[PDB]
Design an enzyme around this catalytic site. Structure first.
Site, short mmCIF file in Angstrom:
data_model
loop_
_atom_site.label_atom_id
_atom_site.label_comp_id
_atom_site.label_asym_id
_atom_site.label_seq_id
_atom_site.Cartn_x
_atom_site.Cartn_y
_atom_site.Cartn_z
CB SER A 130 37.71 35.48 2.73
OG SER A 130 37.96 35.19 1.39
CD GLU A 169 41.10 34.24 1.60
OE1 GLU A 169 41.93 35.01 1.40
OE2 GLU A 169 39.98 34.01 1.15
#
Length: 200
Positions: A130, A169
């Site tokens: 991530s 993200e």
């Protein structure tokens, strides 16, 4: 040239333009959303089983397969810079508790050993990675990694389906090898800055 976004408005503009092209199915979107709610529920089991999907509980395996399958649709359109913040555990158990002095500064002597272990070498993680399009949110983390990711590499902007919108993200595949090209102590002596490269 690697593009680095410096403003949220521009970052959201770019990400949204790419996300619109993915065409992720409903089950793909739900598995990615579940991941964003708490990445540990997926990356944890993946670490535990050393990437062996056959050892995963059936429900987690199913989510892993959908996320993996989603990267067929999600590729970087240009060379881009992404960021991740980390805690000392990222460096491993032999460094976790020695890298920071009592006063929060980076121990210069131990840092030489960290460089020896990691600098100009590849590293692969069992979990998905991530990142964010922006670095601001990682400003107080002890380790910040800047990933230089080339056009064509697997990875997608998932903010529109995240449990936590506004994080900007970008999700990268699991078992993903990256090359550490630089590591430095920051000017305030309280952060390690890592540069890493991804080409696929």
């Amino acid at each position: 040239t690697f593009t680095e976004f410096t403003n949220v408005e521009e970052a959201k503009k770019w990400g949204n333009a790419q996300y619109k092209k993915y065409g992720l199915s409903k089950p793909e979107q739900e598995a990615i959303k579940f991941y964003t709610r708490d990445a540990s529920k997926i990356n944890g089991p993946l670490r535990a089983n050393q990437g062996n999907e056959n050892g995963l509980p059936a429900d987690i395996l199913q989510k892993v397969k959908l996320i993996d399958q989603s990267f067929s649709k999600m590729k970087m359109p240009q060379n881009i810079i992404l960021f991740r913040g980390d805690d000392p555990a990222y460096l491993g158990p032999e460094f976790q508790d020695k890298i920071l002095n009592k006063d929060g500064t980076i121990n210069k002597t131990v840092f030489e050993q960290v460089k020896a272990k990691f600098l100009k070498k590849d590293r692969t993680e069992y979990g998905y990675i991530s990142t964010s399009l922006m670095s601001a949110q990682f400003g107080g983390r002890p380790i910040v990694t800047k990933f230089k990711v080339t056009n064509g590499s697997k990875g997608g902007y998932i903010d529109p389906i995240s449990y936590f919108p506004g994080q900007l993200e970008v999700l990268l595949p699991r078992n993903n090898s990256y090359y550490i090209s630089d590591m430095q102590i920051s000017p305030n002596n309280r952060q390690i800055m890592i540069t890493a490269m991804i080409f696929k």
